[PDB]
Amino acid sequence: LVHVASVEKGRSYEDFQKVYNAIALKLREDDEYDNYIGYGPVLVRLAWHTSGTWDKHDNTGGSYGGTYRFKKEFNDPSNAGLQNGFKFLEPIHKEFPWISSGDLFSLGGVTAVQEMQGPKIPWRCGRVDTPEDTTPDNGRLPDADKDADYVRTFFQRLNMNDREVVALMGAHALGKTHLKRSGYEGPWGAANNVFTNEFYLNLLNEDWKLEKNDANNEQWDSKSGYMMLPTXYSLIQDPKYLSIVKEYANDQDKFFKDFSKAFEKLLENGITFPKDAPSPFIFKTLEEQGL
Numbered sequence: 589l590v591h592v593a594s595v596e597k598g599r600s601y602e603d604f605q606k607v608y609n610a611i612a613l614k615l616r617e618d619d620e621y622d623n624y625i626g627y628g629p630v631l632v633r634l635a636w637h638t639s640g641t642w643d644k645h646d647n648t649g650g651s652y653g654g655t656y657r658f659k660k661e662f663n664d665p666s667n668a669g670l671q672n673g674f675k676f677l678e679p680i681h682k683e684f685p686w687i688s689s690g691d692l693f694s695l696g697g698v699t700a701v702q703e704m705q706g707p708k709i710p711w712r713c714g715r716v717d718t719p720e721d722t723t724p725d726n727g728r729l730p731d732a733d734k735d736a737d738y739v740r741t742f743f744q745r746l747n748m749n750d751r752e753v754v755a756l757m758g759a760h761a762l763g764k765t766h767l768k769r770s771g772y773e774g775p776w777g778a779a780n781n782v783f784t785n786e787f788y789l790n791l792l793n794e795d796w797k798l799e800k801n802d803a804n805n806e807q808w809d810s811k812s813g814y815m816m817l818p819t820x821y822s823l824i825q826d827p828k829y830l831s832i833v834k835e836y837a838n839d840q841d842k843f844f845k846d847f848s849k850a851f852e853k854l855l856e857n858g859i860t861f862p863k864d865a866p867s868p869f870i871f872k873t874l875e876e877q878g879l
């Protein structure tokens with residue numbers, strides 16, 4: 589199918605800035621979640637998993653239809669824990685019932701990145717909810733126990749090249765793995781709820797050991813108490829990925845710019861924006877608005 593963006597009737601930038609603000613205010617208020625990491629990371633992951641089901645070959649999946657609201661997708665084992673992000677967004681949707689589910693899930697991720705001091709991420713409205721039978725089957729999100737060739741091939745399905753992959757993976761500065769959710773345990777760094785290039789610095793600078801965690805899975809652990817998934821560590825095992833890791837470890841602005849482009853692309857894959865659609869919105873943070 590073709591999925592044509594359709595602006596929620598009569599809405600404009602100010603309407604979406606209000607939704608942004610409500611997400612951002614709740615992010616600030618609900619500070620205790622996940623041992624005081626807060627909801628930013630899980631909202632970024634929800635935006636990525638609701639977009640990352642896309643298949644360029646036939647335009648199935650993707651952010652357009654908001655299909656995570658259906659049980660097949662929210663019960664995907666790959667999505668274990670994202671219910672927390674959905675629950676966070678439920679009072680936002682109740683207050684703003686006119687936004688589509690795909691617009692809300694993707695906007696949650698943009699708002700989280702920006703409020704965590706990340707780059708501005710331009711965002712377009714107009715995803716339209718689609719019916720339950722359009723929900724993609726489970727198994728389209730990536731495995732963590734694989735190598736660089738797996739990662740490279742996986743992301744071709746999402747039309748991402750090596751630079752886009754390495755940039756997107758820098759979101760693992762955020763949050764942590766949780767053993768009961770994914771079979772992996774630990775944070776990738778210390779600044780768990782501030783968006784920086786720390787993922788790359790930790791890859792290069794920590795001393796990593798290949799260990800088994802208490803779910804009997806291998807992961808790479810540092811004495812600082814950080815971890816990398818096998819797929820994260822593959823970015824320094826593959827020589828093409830390694831060069832880009834070093835680039836982003838040495839240039840915060842370049843990582844921000846590249847992440848912003850790749851994340852917007854991820855959130856817009858599958859969507860056709862009419863020629864006379866609004867331009868992408870760049871929302872002000874609460875801090876910029878003095879809120």
Ligand code: HEM
Pocket residue numbers: 629630632633636669730731732733739756757759760762763764765766767769770771772817819851
């Ligand atoms: C090869 C690709 C990737 C794999 C295998 C992978 C795998 C994982 C795994 C296993 C977890 C832990 C879930 C848990 O136990 O809570 C996780 C968390 C996370 N992922 Fe990734 N991921 C990948 C790419 C991405 C990308 C592209 C983004 C977004 C741009 C992303 C954002 C995050 C975030 C923010 C978290 C933390 C969630 C929290 O703290 O609740 N990941 N990922």
